[PDB]
Design a protein around this ligand. Structure first.
Ligand code: NAP
Ligand code: NAP
Ligand code: NAP
Ligand code: NAP
Ligand code: CL
Ligand code: CL
Ligand code: CL
Ligand code: CL
Ligand code: CL
Ligand code: MG
Ligand code: MG
Lengths: 258, 259, 256, 255
């Protein structure tokens, strides 16, 4: 009869919500009656996802914005407050994972990944702070990864760096946000079927599939539903923490051990 | 419209559900339409909680049983499988946290705590394996603690050991249970208002409250709602993992971090 | 021309010192001039290891003792203090890793593993508290494992629990021991070429090998040298902590 | 015989003119390791080079900014010229300015990320060929408990930068293993240093009571941990962390 208090009518931002995990998070929240502003740089991709999600209970709309731009963060929050009247949930999700061996990585390569993945998470949280404070039950959910905080994978030394940087930030942010009644937590997916992971190629997807006790790559709904849990009133006592959503992938001591 | 898939009508066991966190877990699942068998050693305590929860949607009944005894674990599962028609969720929750300095801990002190807190988790999971497998969506939630896996506290070196033992066990158990479609995860509460935590005294409670950025001890519902998430179909891809429910307690570097 | 302060003359116990990692810890400390008492249940294995190490700078001798028996812990400490005049280092190392699936493990199976691997670590620490306190620079090094604290491996759910139990114990113990100037820390070996690990077969041994970035199983000296570092005076500010010694094995997002 | 002598080997210590980097430099020098220390302030580099003039291994200085890849390349070339090669890199330079979340500007974040994380990556990249040629390369990163483990108001960007170093090295260790280079990190708790003294006596008098060991750490505690990682005997340790903090991260309640 009753599980979690309904989030209907609340207001959320998902950065990088046009594709992949961000889209699955937006759809998960929208199905729960949360109005969602999704962001991204490509307008056509935002428009297709807004069109695709037009039948959801919560209204998904788009704001074209680069997470690396602090001005775009402020505009995103202001536009979301304008459309919804306030702001309750920020899902700091936008992220990229280009691959490059450490000896090949340029300053620009490193700043590209750290700017989107880490700086872009900090910028949207900063911009959203006052509206989340006015919420009285603010929720920030960060899309980190097992890569960095837990795992290594050749080619992703800067990616993993940026995923760990998110968590180092939120362990302090959680303490600064607690008097404002905002929780901040992070989902750490393992390997989820997305357009972004598709670019890694089939042999990467097979490789990770065989390393996962659950026997499959995860789904965007898996991450959206973890985000949803963190946003509930029922999770008000959870802050500064991580949840690994990976089918057991970080557990095995070795390969065939699965 | 829709948040998670209703768990209405599923079957659960909560060990040590007559008091404290286990009762909060039982009530949380009961309010979700889950039928719950709570266990414990004191029949009066079980009867009173069953009566306290008489008005919940799901049906909360009791089974008097000692987690340290594997035969009781088998009896608990069978009674549950007869009353509910199956078994979908096992909350390995029963535990004790008496306090003793390392130089005072007897073999009995250590075995009492390891047996209740760790052996009693293993035995209930072993007893439930077959019914959980037949459910096709089996869920095990372990009540661990920040104490042991993360923190230390003088007098709890055997308690901390048992809480971390639960986690070492489940990181392998999650792999063995994956082909059976059973996930196993732990909630790691920080400090939660319970009858057991009351026996630590007012100085302990004041000390811990001031250590918590959220500014309060947690409630039993906080832990119940975390166990509820793990038990959802929507958490099928989460196994072998932990969730710390502590108001931020384990974060501060020191006491101006807080102050 | 100076790295760490010589441990020459100090007094150590290594539980389970006749074979495998314990013997490597014992030899590493003896090479550093530490007098070492090794323990084990089999007198022949103790006698043979004492004879093998009879040329080391530190004197290695043996006490036949079961780590699961608290009286044997006490007798071990008393005998070491009688032989050396004190006790500075305790290497709580003794352990077993039989395998069994979750649904096959009997109460006696579980207790055997928890008894040796966890209780035996607690009992030697307890028995040594007094003498370690009197040393003024006491050191406890626990041989834990990546299995349990970090990894899972089917058939070792009770092994993994026992190894993680060591760490939960030591995080509190480090706080109770700090006023006594005793530090307590753990080495978490990955996969180390030993007698006990050879009881897993060549299939298990080749399996972990390709899963390790360093390209090899570790050596008992790798673990002994970690323990040696924790025992230095220079590590007096390290306590309640862990060091994974595994050639990178816990790192890969997949071992392919 | 404790560990194999490192006498005659070659090391870089970034930010080695003060505090922890100076303790690392003096610890390696006392072991007979020739050490190039970097920094931006020549006056502080000259003063430290002179203070350590009696050490067995020779401490010399190269003025360089960790945030500049070209300064990283120059540091490694100058070091290979002076010593004949390079065996050990201690990526240690770091800053910890304090600022509340809502006040951190983009420049504040880039300054801390640039020094603490980018500066670690750049000196490792620059050293890769020389470290590979040594056949026993050693990278030691100075991270922190702050970020990887703890939070402290005002240090959200600093903690991010210290956790960034570890996410980097967990992958870097796998890429470096075929080159026979290990890479680990020391995570100091609270260590008596010059930069740490900028936090004031209130911050000083207050982290001491929360540490089970009962004191702040010393730069030698960090140097000796870095020395362990650099030994031949630690060849099978890579991608890993060592917390040096007197038990500070352990207490459930610091009171
Ligand atoms: N897929 C996995 O297995 C996995 C696992 C662990 C963690 N993650 C994390 O999940 C997050 C998204 O992963 P994904 O697989 O879903 O990626 P994806 O499928 O490639 O989608 C990324 C989204 O982020 C947006 N984006 C990219 N750069 C942006 C920028 N500078 N500003 C604003 N938006 C930007 C993209 O829109 P535009 O390109 O049009 O801007 C797109 O909507 C990342 O943080 C990633 O690290 C993914
Ligand atoms: N309260 C906290 O802050 C906190 C924090 C972290 C973790 N935890 C964990 O949460 C669990 C319960 O904590 P709590 O505060 O709720 O304790 P509690 O209030 O004392 O409740 C303990 C429950 O377990 C039962 N129990 C005790 N021994 C048992 C046994 N041998 N067999 C079966 N049932 C037994 C008790 O009933 P009977 O005595 O009648 O049998 C009681 O119902 C423990 O595992 C504890 O480690 C608690
Ligand atoms: N080998 C690995 O890859 C690995 C990896 C991680 C951790 N570890 C840990 O390292 C420790 C030992 O490993 P190992 O490979 O060296 O094992 P091993 O080769 O089988 O030797 C174990 C030693 O402990 C002794 N022992 C066993 N049971 C005892 C008891 N009840 N009382 C006293 N001594 C006892 C044995 O002598 P007796 O039988 O005669 O008593 C033997 O000397 C264990 O704690 C293990 O968990 C090993
Ligand atoms: N002190 C602690 O309690 C503590 C705890 C955990 C971790 N750590 C870490 O240990 C490292 C050193 O800390 P510390 O307390 O020893 O700081 P410190 O006493 O202030 O010394 C910092 C050193 O880094 C150098 N440096 C600063 N900015 C630089 C730049 N842009 N390029 C090159 N060198 C630069 C400084 O020289 P110049 O100014 O001349 O450049 C100085 O030699 C840091 O990475 C810190 O995060 C410290
Ligand atoms: Cl992290
Ligand atoms: Cl654990
Ligand atoms: Cl652990
Ligand atoms: Cl096994
Ligand atoms: Cl990290
Ligand atoms: Mg795109
Ligand atoms: Mg001698």
């Amino acid at each position: 009869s009753h599980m979690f208090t309904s989030l209907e009518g609340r207001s959320a931002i998902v950065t990088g919500g046009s594709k992949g995990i961000g889209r699955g998070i937006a759809e998960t929240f929208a199905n729960a009656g949360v109005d969602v502003v999704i962001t991204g740089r490509n307008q056509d991709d935002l428009d297709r996802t807004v069109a695709d999600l037009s039948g959801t209970r919560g209204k998904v709309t788009a704001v074209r914005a680069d997470v690396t731009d602090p001005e775009d963060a402020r505009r995103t929050v202001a536009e979301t407050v304008s459309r919804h009247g306030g702001l309750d949930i920020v899902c700091a999700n936008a992220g990229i994972f280009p691959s490059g061996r450490l000896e090949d990585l340029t300053p620009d390569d490193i700043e590209q990944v750290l700017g989107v993945n880490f700086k872009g998470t900090v910028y949207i949280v900063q911009a959203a702070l006052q509206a989340l404070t006015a919420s009285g039950h603010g929720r920030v959910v960060v899309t980190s990864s097992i890569t960095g905080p837990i795992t290594g994978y050749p080619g992703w030394s800067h990616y993993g760096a940026s995923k760990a940087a998110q968590l180092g930030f939120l362990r302090t942010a959680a303490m600064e946000l607690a008097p404002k009644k905002i929780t901040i937590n992070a989902v750490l997916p393992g390997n989820i079927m997305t357009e972004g992971l598709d670019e890694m190629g089939q042999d990467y997807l097979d490789q990770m599939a065989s390393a996962i006790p659950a026997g499959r790559l995860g789904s965007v709904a898996d991450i959206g539903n973890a985000a949803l849990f963190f946003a509930t009133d029922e999770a008000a006592y959870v802050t500064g923490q991580t949840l690994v959503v990976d089918g057991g992938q970080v557990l095995p001591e070795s390969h065939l051990a699965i």
